[PDB]
Amino acid sequence: PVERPFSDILTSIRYWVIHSITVPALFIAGWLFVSTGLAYDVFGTPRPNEYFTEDRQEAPLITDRFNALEQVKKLSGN
Amino acid sequence: VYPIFTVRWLAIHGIAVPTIFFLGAITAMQFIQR
Amino acid sequence: RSWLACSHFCLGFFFFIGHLWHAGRARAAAAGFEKGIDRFDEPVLSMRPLD
Amino acid sequence: ALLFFFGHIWHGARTIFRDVFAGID
Amino acid sequence: DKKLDERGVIAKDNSGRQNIFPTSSKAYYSSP
Amino acid sequence: RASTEQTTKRAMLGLLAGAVAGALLVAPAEAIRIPSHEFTGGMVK
Amino acid sequence: MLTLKIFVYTVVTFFVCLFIFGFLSNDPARNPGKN
Amino acid sequence: MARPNPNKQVVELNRTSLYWGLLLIFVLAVLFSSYIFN
Amino acid sequence: TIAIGTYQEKRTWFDDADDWLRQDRFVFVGWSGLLLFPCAYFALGGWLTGTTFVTSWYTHGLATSYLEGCNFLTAAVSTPANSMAHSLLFVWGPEAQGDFTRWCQLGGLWAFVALHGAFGLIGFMLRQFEIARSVNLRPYNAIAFSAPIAVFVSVFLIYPLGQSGWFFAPSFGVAAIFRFILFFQGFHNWTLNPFHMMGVAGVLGAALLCAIHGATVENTLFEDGDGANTFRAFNPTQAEETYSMVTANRFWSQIFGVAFSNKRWLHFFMLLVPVTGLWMSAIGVVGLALNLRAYDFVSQEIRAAEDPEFETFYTKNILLNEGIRAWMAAQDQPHERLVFPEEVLPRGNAL
Amino acid sequence: AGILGVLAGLFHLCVRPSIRLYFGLSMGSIETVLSSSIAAVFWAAFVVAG
Amino acid sequence: NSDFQEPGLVTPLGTLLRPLNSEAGKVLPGWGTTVLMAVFILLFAAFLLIILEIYNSSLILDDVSMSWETLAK
Amino acid sequence: EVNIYGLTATALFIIIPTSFLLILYVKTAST
Amino acid sequence: MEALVYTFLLVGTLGIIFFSIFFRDPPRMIK
Amino acid sequence: NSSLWARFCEWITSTENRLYIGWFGVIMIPCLLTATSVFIIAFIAAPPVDIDGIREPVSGSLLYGNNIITGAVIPTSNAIGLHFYPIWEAASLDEWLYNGGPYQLIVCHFLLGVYCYMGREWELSFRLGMRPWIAVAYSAPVAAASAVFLVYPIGQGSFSDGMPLGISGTFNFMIVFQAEHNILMHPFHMLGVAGVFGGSLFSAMHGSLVTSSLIRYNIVAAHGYFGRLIFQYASFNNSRSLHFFLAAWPVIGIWFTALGLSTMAFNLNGFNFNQSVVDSQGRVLNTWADIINRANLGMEVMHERNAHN
Amino acid sequence: AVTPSLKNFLGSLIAGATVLGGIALAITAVSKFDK
Amino acid sequence: GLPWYRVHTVVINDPGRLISVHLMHTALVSGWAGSMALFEISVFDPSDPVLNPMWRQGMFVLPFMTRLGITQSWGGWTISGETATNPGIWSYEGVAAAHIILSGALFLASVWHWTYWDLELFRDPRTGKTALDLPKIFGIHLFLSGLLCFGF
Ligand code: CLA
Ligand code: CLA
Ligand code: CLA
Ligand code: CLA
Ligand SMILES: C=Cc1c(C)c2cc3nc(c4c5[nH]c(cc6nc(cc1[nH]2)C(C)=C6CC)c(C)c5C(=O)[C@@H]4C(=O)OC)[C@@H](CCC(=O)OC/C=C(\C)CCC[C@H](C)CCC[C@H](C)CCCC(C)C)[C@@H]3C
Ligand SMILES: CC(C)=CCC/C(C)=C/CC/C(C)=C/CC/C(C)=C/CC/C(C)=C/CC/C(C)=C/CC/C(C)=C/CC/C(C)=C/CC/C(C)=C/CC1=CC(=O)C(C)=C(C)C1=O
Ligand SMILES: CCCCCCCCCCCCCCCC(=O)OC[C@H](COP(=O)(O)OC[C@@H](O)CO)OC(=O)CCCCCCCCCCCCCCC
Ligand SMILES: CC1=C(/C=C/C(C)=C/C=C/C(C)=C/C=C/C=C(C)/C=C/C=C(C)/C=C/C2=C(C)CCCC2(C)C)C(C)(C)CCC1
Ligand SMILES: CC1=C(/C=C/C(C)=C/C=C/C(C)=C/C=C/C=C(C)/C=C/C=C(C)/C=C/C2=C(C)CCCC2(C)C)C(C)(C)CCC1
Ligand SMILES: [Fe+2]
């Protein structure tokens, strides 16, 4: 009912035990998220060898609103 | 003093967990030959 | 030459600022009011008004 | 419209805080 | 300075300047 | 082609990141909070 | 214009000498503190 | 012609307010005159 | 009669919710929190995600992301393409069709961040009002914040709404904002607008007031401490003020000519200058939203055209704007499909 | 809208505000109505301009 | 003052309209009809969203064409 | 006489507020 | 004609500044 | 005590004058009065000045077809460079006007006047018992003006690169300076912008809290509002530390921006991220820095004349 | 006819109602627990 | 001693003076409408309706009259470029004159309500102090506004 101070948790053992094993899990999760290439697929960021398609040799252009989904699918090469 | 999962806990974690995740992601990005 | 000029201009400017600061403080401390106005004999209160 | 947004803010503040602005109970 | 009068005029509000405020009407249920 | 070329530096950096983050997040919060207890502990509203 | 140059030099020298002799006239002793 | 209104105060403008107003109007005129004249 | 006071009825769910929200903890939630904390949170999140993974390749033809090899200065969350003129770019909207990847590629993250940030600003202003009401204070901070929220609303919503689409709104980044600034200089002559002049005066005067007030207060302090450090010679429960108003007034009346003699008026002036400046800037940008720009000085243009042997700094600024526009439009507006040959690009040696 | 207005008007002639709403919005003061009306004309100004 | 500084002027229209400005301050107990107000506010918000999305081309309906070309019917 | 309307606008903007402020100052100074 | 207007406006601003500096109402409120 | 020199010293140092003079005063007052007189006279009725030294004069006076916004005092001709160019060294008064001497006169006298103003601030603070560190605060605008008017021309090599004493002249100076050095990406200009914006923020917020607190408590009642509004409990609990922070933020920001301008005078530069992102095969992917570079290149191409007759 | 955009908009209405209900239930549950 | 920006607050309590003030504002706005109508009619050039329409001549209030049915004029011309034979009571000049007459009538009513500010209508039977029943006033005004909207 008094919202325990931060000093008490700092000296606690359960807090350190949980965090020393959980924070590295998040760090490795992010490292693997970027390394395995899942970031490119999820966020649509092209890989350094996919910026320019075989048929396209210039920056893409949407030039279409209600069919923008198909336009982006075609431009991205997928 | 005893209860956990308070508003302070949620406020801290909501900005702490993604921060660690993104730090890992950026550190991984650093080591890209490109 | 560019590095030398830039660095030493910056250092000279900061050291002129330091001269201002330390000269002012030294003169005030010699006068005896480097810590503030006395609050019992304010010199301003002993001057004609409507300066 | 923008000026009247500011006016709305000011007059709502002077409504909700009537007692504080008037310095009464 | 309190007692802003029935006209809402306060000689010196918390700003130290004269001002006028509306007289809020209190609420009842039935009344006579 | 884009792919991480470092194998084991990930864990070494993650351990340090977590160890530093724990302390660095608990300490300033303590410093800011103690005055919050002081203010909201008898003279509030 | 020699006359203009001489006049400006005279004015500047007069003002600069006035300033220098002003700060040499026991400046630090004229303050409202007593020390 | 019915009854004097109790809610009758008077506007008051000290000298500093006068100077502020004159400065504001003259500075605005300085800023906007070139644009008004084109 | 049957009179009544305040809170003389049975309690309700609203009372319990209000009591819980307005407690005394590390973070004051309040009712406004329900609108502020989520929205603002997502905004920040969006931006960070936007600046870390997503790309603006398909919107601007640029690469703005840490995953693509950009700094903190060059990364940004770019605005959508000009084809999506004013579409709110919902994830479920006809453009994205519910696809998150294509939504990110189309630039919807910018709209996400902008809208959630606007509602976060609303929530923050309501939070300031609620705090002031809780502590029985006049909410002048609410007006002081009404200034920046007006600036944000103008620049980030009214300007793109009056233009061809969101594409011309600022993109959330450092270099992006620099591009926005140079674009205004080239296309609108924003420096010559009287309203940006008023805003510049307000902001610079606010900085001047801050510096002068701090220096004057720290250099007219009352000696109420033996130690040579004057910061410990003060406690919050003091009775008298910690600086001599009379001495400061005399000093600034003898050095400058005029000086303050009222703490309330001085601090209200400090509050007033920036708010007025930013409101004037907002009005100017609202004018620009409709391309109602201060550009002409028709008499100067006529005189310059009549005889080439008449050059003022205004004419040089006009030529610089022509250069900026001509050399930027090729890449800053890819949807125009502009190909300027080197022959027609404006140049100084061609004058 | 016209018809609804009429109906709404009838309601507002025959139903008194709740005490909680009366004190929450300070319906006894003439300044709250000014704030609300300024907001309404503000909204209408954007709508017509757009 | 007595009766707020003596009674005011009396006019036929004043007496006719007096009932409409007599019961000032009367309120209902509790929350009254605030829930209905909330329901109507929510419905109005939905209506405003519908019209905004129709006029923003974020909600394409069959009947509406949303362009100047609809002026030819 | 160039831009008669501009001159009129400037003169009115300088006169009406100035006259208003001076009248108010004179009226209050009598107190 | 424009030059005269600009000069008059600038002279008026300078005169207002001078009057505010020298013919100000005395600050006895706090002094 | 009754000597004429003693009486003159007493009058100069007397605190009973409506405006304090002091010895810094006896130096500055002629300097600033000369500067303002020459500035007014040239702004109203100066003839065109050959800024670029290619016999293409630039008009900047009100009589010669200008208004308040577009008027200015044109800097000295590029032919003169850094040479001292008083009236008595020009062949004739007309040539002195043509080359642009009044700018040099005004700038020199103005710089001396502002330095002596900084001195007399301290002098009066000393004669009144105040602490002496208002001159330190004023040194920031003085440093910035010194940079813009003397140090940039020194590094570049000519007084024609100084800021014209005008409005549109100031905008032209900024645009050219961005074209040549890319100021926007320099960290010191970023610090200056941060200082200015933060100073505005702090002025507005300090005024808000103090005005709210002042009733008919100045720091113990308002601190409850700010401690929970944006957290930061016990951030500035002292009326002295808070005001020192107010004084320190903008002053340091402006010091840094002035130093950045001087370094650009000696021409290091702002940042330069041109072509900093490349894909496989070596193709260049544009960033916002590249668009900024295109704008800079356009500005630069317009600034240079090259072909001069 | 019920166009796909209309269906998506109705789904958005449902989702926003769900979010508001979630916030309301959270505050209700915690307030009841603490009082 | 009210400041210059708190002056009109002297009308914040007595409803009669508030009514007078609002009548004055209404009269001013109506007079502006009529005056601009007259000015634009004096400046309007109706010879060419194809290459010299209203919007090219800077007209502001003329299109707002035309949008609702005012076409003809007492000068014999029409916004169509044709010529009108029986303009009728409702023309541009007629509308402007009507607005001016309304402005004057509202001015007279404003001065009347300013003089006779103390009316029994503004004092509630209980507590005999000035008060407005804002909810019921709003109900009446909303009823009238809805009726007018439906009629239009
Ligand atoms: C040889 C020269 C010299 C000497 C011996 C001193 C000696 C002293 N000074 Mg002075 N001073 C100098 C130069 C000098 N100063 C200059 C050039 C400046 C201008 C900035 C100042 C400004 C200054 C102030 C404003 C104050 C002093 C104070 C002091 C005293 C305490 C030392 C201190 O600040 O704590 C130790 C210092 C620190 C913990 C600060 C370290 C962090 C610094 C600011 C940044 C680190 C450098 C950074 C990387 C470079 C950035 C700039 C770069 C572009 C070059 C001591 C008597 C203080 C005092 O008590 O006066 C009586 C005081 O208030 N001095
Ligand atoms: C429905 C509209 C409406 C109404 C009825 C009021 C009524 C009132 N306001 Mg509010 N206000 C409004 C809109 C409105 N205001 C808007 C849109 C803004 C934003 C700018 C404000 C901002 C505002 C502030 C900041 C304050 C008030 C105050 C007041 C009160 C005193 C009037 C005043 O300022 O002194 C009379 C003012 C003058 C005689 C000066 C007039 C000079 C102006 C600035 C220039 C000339 C205007 C021009 C001739 C006509 C413009 C027309 C345009 C509106 C289309 C009064 C109750 C004051 C008050 O009581 O609070 C303590 C106060 O402090 N109002
Ligand atoms: C209070 C917090 C809050 C606020 C103000 C907003 C506000 C917004 N969000 Mg965010 N959002 C939030 C929380 C919030 N969100 C949370 C917690 C999440 C995570 C789950 C998200 C996830 C999210 C995404 C992923 C997106 C948004 C988007 C939006 C925007 C579109 C709003 C919209 O159409 O929603 C719907 C609004 C309503 C449903 C209004 C309520 C109306 C009720 C339901 C009426 C019901 C009455 C009746 C039954 C209806 C009858 C009609 C019919 C059924 C017969 C808007 C700026 C979108 C956007 O514009 O991004 C660019 C977007 O893409 N938000
Ligand atoms: C002396 C030089 C100078 C100065 C002082 C200014 C001053 C100004 N200019 Mg600039 N300008 C100049 C030269 C200058 N200009 C030149 C030469 C050009 C070239 C034409 C421009 C082009 C220009 C443009 C294009 C614009 C300005 C704008 C502005 C105003 C900015 C207001 C503001 O704070 O917005 C920034 C503040 C906000 C947007 C408020 C939002 C704040 C949110 C709520 C905070 C978010 C929370 C955040 C995550 C917390 C993190 C904190 C962390 C950073 C520490 C201000 C009056 C802008 C303006 O106001 O127009 C209306 C604008 O759009 N100017
Ligand atoms: C660069 C300009 C600038 C910034 C960044 C800024 C920032 C801030 N000022 C605040 C306050 C204020 N500012 C004030 C006056 C002023 N502020 C000014 C200029 C600024 N003020 C000026 C010029 C004035 C004078 C009028 C006042 C009076 C206040 C306050 O009371 C308040 C405070 O308490 O300060 C301590 C805070 C508001 C917190 C917030 O967003 O609520 C939460 C809402 C959020 C987070 C939603 C915002 C989401 C945004 C719009 C989306 C984009 C976010 C990305 C990070 C964008 C990155 C962009 C790249 C270019 C970097 C914040 C620290
Ligand atoms: C021929 C000639 C004449 C040539 C002229 C050519 C030419 C270029 C003309 C100039 C044109 C010109 C005037 C341009 C400016 C026009 C312009 C843009 C106007 C802006 C107007 C405007 C409405 C802007 C809105 C924003 C606004 C309100 C800004 C206000 C700016 C402002 C006045 C800032 C304050 C400045 C200032 C110096 C304050 C110092 C105050 C001071 C002395 C405090 C000291 C002090 C501190 C203490 O702490 C205490 C305790 C005490 C006691 C005390 O005293
Ligand atoms: C009930 C929602 C629970 C949370 C869902 C997960 C949230 C995180 C979403 C991350 C992005 C993943 C893609 C989701 C997007 C997605 O996949 O949508 C898809 C879904 C259905 O579309 P379909 O895929 O069936 O459409 C396919 C074709 O028929 C299209 O023509 O759209 C909806 O029905 C609305 C969903 C809203 C989901 C967002 C919830 C928030 C709504 C806004 C709340 C406003 C509150 C306002 C309060 C005043
Ligand atoms: C997905 C998404 C979402 C959400 C999101 C979020 C919510 C996010 C968050 C996020 C976050 C929450 C993030 C964070 C991040 C962070 C970071 C990224 C950080 C960084 C840092 C740094 C980088 C630092 C640096 C430094 C320092 C300060 C220390 C030392 C020094 C230096 C400078 C190095 C949703 C579903 C709704 C929708 C869609 C989108
Ligand atoms: C400047 C400007 C402005 C404003 C303006 C205004 C506001 C105006 C107003 C105006 C007005 C407000 C006007 C009015 C007019 C009026 C009139 C003109 C009237 C007339 C009347 C008459 C004529 C009457 C008659 C009569 C009567 C009395 C009744 C009986 C019968 C008779 C018929 C005899 C602003 C700021 C916005 C900005 C822009 C511009
Ligand atoms: Fe202060």
XYZ file of C-alpha atoms in Angstrom, chain P:
152
model
C -10.619 50.353 -12.454
C -10.978 47.479 -14.885
C -8.147 46.906 -17.379
C -8.793 47.583 -21.044
C -9.192 43.846 -21.740
C -11.659 43.127 -18.899
C -13.983 46.000 -19.795
C -16.993 44.233 -21.288
C -17.175 41.889 -18.286
C -19.346 44.633 -16.750
C -22.205 42.939 -18.640
C -21.460 39.465 -17.255
C -24.343 39.509 -14.744
C -27.272 41.693 -15.822
C -29.045 39.928 -18.724
C -30.627 43.123 -20.059
C -27.325 44.789 -20.882
C -26.112 41.498 -22.365
C -29.152 41.450 -24.653
C -28.509 45.064 -25.650
C -24.863 44.292 -26.422
C -25.773 41.242 -28.497
C -28.350 43.312 -30.383
C -25.659 45.879 -31.171
C -23.332 43.172 -32.479
C -26.128 41.725 -34.620
C -26.903 45.186 -35.995
C -23.246 45.748 -36.874
C -22.927 42.432 -38.705
C -26.185 42.940 -40.621
C -25.122 46.449 -41.596
C -21.817 45.082 -42.850
C -23.677 42.533 -44.963
C -25.834 45.229 -46.530
C -22.921 47.606 -47.079
C -20.792 44.963 -48.804
C -23.742 43.950 -50.970
C -24.156 47.571 -52.058
C -20.424 48.087 -52.614
C -20.054 44.965 -54.746
C -23.186 45.809 -56.740
C -21.657 49.221 -57.419
C -18.347 47.639 -58.470
C -19.762 44.589 -60.281
C -19.480 44.439 -64.082
C -22.164 42.062 -65.431
C -21.532 42.414 -69.183
C -19.420 39.257 -69.539
C -20.574 36.167 -67.579
C -18.223 33.681 -69.294
C -14.723 35.188 -69.133
C -15.455 37.754 -66.377
C -17.545 35.961 -63.726
C -18.098 36.948 -60.099
C -15.067 35.094 -58.767
C -12.746 36.929 -61.171
C -13.954 40.346 -59.949
C -13.254 39.729 -56.262
C -16.907 39.581 -55.231
C -17.413 37.992 -51.810
C -21.036 38.256 -50.643
C -22.603 38.203 -54.123
C -21.995 34.444 -54.603
C -23.559 33.751 -51.203
C -26.736 35.555 -52.252
C -26.740 33.785 -55.620
C -26.282 30.359 -54.015
C -29.758 30.657 -52.465
C -31.771 32.231 -55.284
C -30.979 35.938 -55.712
C -30.240 36.422 -59.418
C -31.799 39.613 -60.782
C -31.036 43.261 -60.042
C -32.756 46.632 -60.243
C -30.194 47.732 -62.832
C -31.883 45.493 -65.387
C -29.117 42.891 -65.540
C -28.980 39.326 -64.250
C -26.104 37.246 -62.938
C -26.685 35.155 -66.091
C -25.750 37.948 -68.495
C -29.377 38.200 -69.629
C -31.620 41.163 -68.777
C -34.325 41.203 -66.104
C -37.692 42.861 -66.731
C -39.434 42.370 -63.353
C -36.692 42.087 -60.712
C -39.214 42.043 -57.873
C -38.758 42.864 -54.219
C -35.984 40.273 -53.735
C -32.942 41.471 -55.673
C -29.376 42.254 -54.639
C -30.272 45.860 -53.825
C -33.462 44.763 -52.088
C -31.593 42.293 -49.892
C -28.945 44.889 -49.020
C -31.576 47.491 -48.125
C -33.454 44.918 -46.052
C -30.292 44.089 -44.109
C -29.624 47.792 -43.499
C -33.176 48.360 -42.233
C -32.808 45.355 -39.933
C -29.508 46.754 -38.659
C -31.215 50.013 -37.754
C -34.155 48.298 -36.067
C -31.784 46.126 -34.035
C -29.848 49.252 -33.046
C -33.028 50.879 -31.729
C -33.978 47.720 -29.838
C -30.448 47.591 -28.416
C -30.653 51.122 -27.045
C -34.078 50.366 -25.573
C -32.844 47.224 -23.817
C -29.810 49.160 -22.576
C -31.978 51.880 -21.037
C -34.505 49.527 -19.396
C -32.021 46.995 -18.071
C -33.838 46.104 -14.825
C -36.743 43.815 -15.735
C -38.694 41.460 -13.491
C -38.263 38.753 -16.134
C -34.613 38.312 -15.109
C -35.284 37.766 -11.377
C -36.335 34.311 -10.239
C -39.327 34.145 -7.864
C -37.187 32.579 -5.114
C -34.196 34.541 -3.746
C -35.186 37.541 -5.922
C -31.749 37.738 -7.554
C -30.775 37.932 -11.209
C -30.500 34.484 -12.770
C -30.935 32.722 -16.107
C -32.326 29.190 -16.416
C -29.721 28.205 -18.969
C -30.965 24.633 -19.663
C -34.500 25.800 -20.481
C -33.228 28.778 -22.483
C -31.109 26.342 -24.487
C -34.116 24.089 -24.967
C -36.208 26.938 -26.364
C -33.424 28.177 -28.627
C -32.679 24.665 -29.914
C -36.372 24.106 -30.615
C -36.473 27.319 -32.649
C -33.237 26.524 -34.497
C -34.447 23.046 -35.411
C -37.763 24.449 -36.597
C -35.984 26.967 -38.826
C -33.590 24.314 -40.158
C -36.496 22.031 -41.025
C -38.330 24.899 -42.700
C -35.293 25.767 -44.797
